[PDB]
């Protein structure tokens, strides 16, 4: 109650200070030693780098400025960086440094070699209710924090979730996040996770994040998503149908929580009622959840994963980066 209200006041002070004065050019390419390519992003490579003084490793996203412009992602790229530099939470991947040169933008990310929940769920099949509850608890507090800042996450899915070296969740990609008060209308997100009000273009708010949590919790515990089909449009039709069947092994409590999260009626969906997130945190399925020890990372994990051009391009477009 009272500690949560002070904590969020401090959270929001900390955020608004960075949000209204974003940090720019906080490092330089020459401070980093290039090791190997980690993968490909939409606008360029993601490189493993080692800082030269600290020896710490990072995953440096390189974004070609001209490729950003012609894939039409200028404002999104600027917005993603502005949000990343301004937030701080145990379960959010950190933007450690950002800067730009003649050709590229660079987002130097925390690097956690780990294993994404996507692969882990695939290989293990499904999680016990306690294993899943432990993940879902970190998502709840993450959304509590993100929503107090008026941020909608809008992209929850196992691919954006890695299991770090202490076995905790790290939320990995802010490509779709948006700061908004009230409502917004963009269609985005992988189909399996979209709330009905997104599909139907009627406008939506941060309550879509709690629907998507209902989906993830369902998927982690069943081993498959509740709404699934061969084509995206069939997925869309099954979500709007809204008829959901639970496996025979789902507890009475889990079913009851899932029905309050996968709820088409916004006036009834958990998370966005007068009691806020406590309607979720106070549910019987979370009775055994110690929320403070989750936040402190003190709860024992269910498992610990396996062992440039000479000319300046698009200067006006990227001035605030």
Phi, psi of 95 (to 5 degrees): -85, 110
Q: Does residue 192 contact residue 157 with C-beta atoms inside 8 Å?
A: yes
DSSP string across 44-95: SEEEEEEETTT--EEEEEEEEHHHHHHTT-HHHHHHHHHHHTT---TTB--E
Mark the binding-site residues for ATP, compressed into ranges.
38-46, 61, 110-116, 157-160
Which residues have C-beta within 8 Å of that of residue 101, sequence separation ≥ 6?
A: 29, 308
Using what technique was this structure determined? X-ray
Q: Are 90 and 66 in contact (CB under 8 A)?
A: no
Q: Please, are residues 30 and 49 in contact by the beta-carbon 8 Å criterion?
A: no
Q: What is the largest CA-CA distance in the chain?
A: 64
**290 flagged as catalytic:** no
Per-residue buried b or exposed e for 205-244, using 16+ beta carbons within 10 Å of the residue's own CB: bbbbbbbbbbbbbbbbbbeebbbeeeeeeebbebbeeeeb
| Active-site position among 155, 253, 256, 279 | 155
Residues flagged as binding site:
38-46, 61, 110-116, 157-160
Residue 168: CB atoms within 10 Å: 20
Which two three-digit tokens encode residue 154? 């809008």
To 5 degrees, how large is the angle CA 85–CA 176–CA 46? 65
- Do the Cβ atoms of 226 and 232 come closer than 8 Å? no
Walk me through the domains of the chain, giving residue ranges and CATH numbers: 1-21+116-306 (1.10.510.10), 22-115+307-319 (3.30.200.20)
CA distance 162 to 139: 12
């Amino acid at each position: 109650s009272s500690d949560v209200k002070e904590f969020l006041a401090k959270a929001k002070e900390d955020f608004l200070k960075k949000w209204e004065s974003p940090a720019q050019n906080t490092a330089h390419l020459d401070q980093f030693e290039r090791i190997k390519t980690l993968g490909t992003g939409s606008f360029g490579r993601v490189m493993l780098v080692k800082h030269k003084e600290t020896g710490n490793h990072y995953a440096m996203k390189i974004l070609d400025k001209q490729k950003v412009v012609k894939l039409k992602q200028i404002e999104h790229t600027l917005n993603e960086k502005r949000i990343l530099q301004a937030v701080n939470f145990p379960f959010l991947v950190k933007l450690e440094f950002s800067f730009k040169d003649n050709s590229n933008l660079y987002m130097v990310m925390e690097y956690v070699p780990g294993g994404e929940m996507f692969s882990h769920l695939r290989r293990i099949g499904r999680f016990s209710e306690p294993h899943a509850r432990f993940y879902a608890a970190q998502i709840v507090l993450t959304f509590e924090y993100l929503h107090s800042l008026d941020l909608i996450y809008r992209d929850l899915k196992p691919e954006n979730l890695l299991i770090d070296q202490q076995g905790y969740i790290q939320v990995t990609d802010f490509g779709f996040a948006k700061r908004v008060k009230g409502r917004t209308w963009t269609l985005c997100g992988t189909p399996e996770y979209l709330a009905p009000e997104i599909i139907l273009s009627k406008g939506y708010n941060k309550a879509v994040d709690w629907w998507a949590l209902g989906v993830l919790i369902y998927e982690m515990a069943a081993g498959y998503p509740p709404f699934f089909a061969d084509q995206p449009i069939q997925i869309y039709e099954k979500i709007v149908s809204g008829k959901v069947r639970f496996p025979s092994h789902f507890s009475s409590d889990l079913k009851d929580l899932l029905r309050n999260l996968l709820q088409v009626d916004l006036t009834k969906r958990f998370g966005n009622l007068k009691n806020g997130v406590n309607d979720i945190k106070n549910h019987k399925w979370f009775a055994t959840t110690d929320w403070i020890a989750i936040y402190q990372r003190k709860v024992e994990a269910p498992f610990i994963p396996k062992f440039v051009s000479i000319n300046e391009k698009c200067g006006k477009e990227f001035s605030e980066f």
